[PDB]
Amino acid sequence: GLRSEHREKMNRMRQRIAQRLKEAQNTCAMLTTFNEIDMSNIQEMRARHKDAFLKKHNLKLGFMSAFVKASAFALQEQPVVNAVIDDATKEVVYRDYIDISVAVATPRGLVVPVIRNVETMNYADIERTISELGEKARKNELAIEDMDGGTFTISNGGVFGSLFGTPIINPPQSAILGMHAIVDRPVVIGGKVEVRPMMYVALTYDHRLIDGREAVTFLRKIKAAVEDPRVLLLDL
Amino acid sequence: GLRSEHREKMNRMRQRIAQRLKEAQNTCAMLTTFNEIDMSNIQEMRARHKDAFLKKHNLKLGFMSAFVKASAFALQEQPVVNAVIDDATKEVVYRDYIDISVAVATPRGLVVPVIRNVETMNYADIERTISELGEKARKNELAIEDMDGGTFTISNGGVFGSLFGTPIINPPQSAILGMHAIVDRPVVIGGKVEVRPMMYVALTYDHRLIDGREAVTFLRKIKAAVEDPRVLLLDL
Amino acid sequence: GLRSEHREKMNRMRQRIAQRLKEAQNTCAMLTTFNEIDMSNIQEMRARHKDAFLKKHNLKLGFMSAFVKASAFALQEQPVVNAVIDDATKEVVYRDYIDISVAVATPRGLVVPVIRNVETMNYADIERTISELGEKARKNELAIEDMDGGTFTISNGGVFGSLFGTPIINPPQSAILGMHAIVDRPVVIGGKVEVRPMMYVALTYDHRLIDGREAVTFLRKIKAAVEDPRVLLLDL
């Protein structure tokens, strides 16, 4: 055999990132709750609205916008999940606005832009902002003010094939949604086993501020808004 | 868009609750292990003993009592899981008695009464105590001595539709059982795919005191006692 | 009812173990990601190569060696997962060698020997080392130098029937693989529901050093190497 232990020194900013990551766990009391979403409806919608959508808006219709809009609706329903707890003053600051940070992928790494005031956006606007920030961040010119102060987060581990896992809360928030890969699985529809494209979804919430019942109902609201997008119009 | 950050100050007791919650994680070394329970037998039992049980005892036959009794049996089998570790004296205090705290739901919130000395109770007694405490706590007159000093806990996230998640240990204990919603899922019975009502069950245990093998065997014991209630009579 | 709280004092070494266990969580930023592995191929291989393998090597062909070799291949593919982070000097020490610690079961308890330089071993060598250490540790004569300094770990909760759970990183490492019990489950093969022997696999990684994408790809690499062992020969 052989032995060798070459090494590299940790730079300043990576050390800062590690310290911040540990502070995130040492500040919040994190727990996770899982659920499954039937992705048939979104796939069926996009597989026929993609062509006309591409012609109209010069954009590709992914399913990220549906999740972003559903999460925005769920947050609007339950303000507490949109709030954050500040220990420096012993105050639970609420927020009337809602902006969401979505992770984008670059060969150099992954970064998290922010979508400002998502409550007034359609699917087209969300997709356009996502594409604009994904091409703007592909080149390194992404400034701090486009990454600062998200209230809620959506993490994408699905594109790499994970089944389900526990994400970690980005410091200045109270929750994070972690999506995962879509897999064909057998499910029971109307008392009969059937094959559908399903995906597990995991939510991590700060148990100090958000009760377990609140987190579970919030996740079920996201599920309801993603399975049948027409729920968004009914304000149901 | 618009921005507004109205806020509310955290009261004394909620701050104390948050501090206690963080102390719970900073004291124990928590891990989780999951399993699945086939709920066919309990449903079939209650769907035909409900009427005569209601006439005899003036009570509704839920499946909470079955889980409470099965957990009591499992705890009696493995004393270590019923013990707690005291850092203030460096002693692992065992307990010959067994009392279990079960979470009840109220519109104002959720609270956790205690069932004293569950080892000598039938299903009828457990159901009667649960109903009595659920109606007594519906009105606010629930005193401290009815909530102090549980050795083991059963958490109910199922009624809200969660699939599975990781609960957090109530401070003065070594484990907690978290039930979840019952869903019809395809399973393999005798080499053939079949549809049954299943439910995921999660156990969180303090890894300092309880070994992984012990936790897994304890969870399997609960599964065995809940799938086939006649195991309780055999002392098997 | 009755009450009694006899107790036993925690000895020195068990207290040290608990302190080390808590230090493990307070040092690393741990997260978990899960996946499922189709175990048909390994079962089919061993169910017909077992007899000739037993005659040739006087050994029983388990599936532990396949997992050990697949994990070694995955580690060799991604050096960062094999590295560890040292806070005492602010350096990320890499390792050109690879040794793996595998948990063995004894009636007195469970212990974790080490397999040195697994990158140059076949299935036969890994099985022989596992058997030798399992019989050597059955008797208490297992020295420290046979347990010190593993770079990666494989934990066995399957033999006790667990479905899936979150293991805890052994201090001087950056990841741990936790296997679980094999269960027959319905899966979709070529658009049609089918019954196969499956098993959930969980990876716990230190989020300070290993990115989520890296962990997910590493787990998928293990899955690819275990489902089709011929991937090992192709260096694919």
Author numbering:
A (entry chain F), B (entry chain E), C (entry chain D): 220 to 455
What did the original publication write about this model?
The α-keto acid dehydrogenase complex family catalyzes the essential oxidative decarboxylation of α-keto acids to yield acyl-CoA and NADH. PDC, OGDC, and BCKDC are each comprised of multiple copies of a substrate-specific dihydrolipoamide acetyltransferase (E2p), dihydrolipoamide succinyltransferase (E2o), or dihydrolipoamide acyltransferase (E2b) inner catalytic (IC) core surrounded by multiple copies of the respective α-keto acid dehydrogenase (E1p, E1o, or E1b) and universal dihydrolipoamide dehydrogenase (E3) components. In addition, despite sharing a similar monomeric fold, OGDC and PDC E2 cores have distinct interdomain and intertrimer interactions, which suggests a means of modulating self-assembly to mitigate heterologous binding between mismatched E2 species.
After fitting and real-space refinement of the model into our cubic cryo-EM density map, the side chains for the E2o model fit the density well. The unambiguous identification of the cubic complex as OGDC is further reflected in the low presence of BCKDC components in the mass spectrometry data. For E2o, the backbones of residues 220–455 are fully traceable. The longer βC–βD turn in E2o enables an electrostatic interaction between the negatively charged surface of the turn and the positively charged surfaces of the N-terminus that is not present in E2p. The H2 kink in E2o positions the C-terminal end of the helix more closely against H7* for hydrogen bonds between Lys275 and His276 with Asp454* and Asp454*, respectively. The exterior of the E2o socket is more charged than that of E2p, which leads to the greater number of hydrogen bonds at the E2o intertrimer interface. The E2o cryo-EM density map also contains a putative lipoyl moiety density.
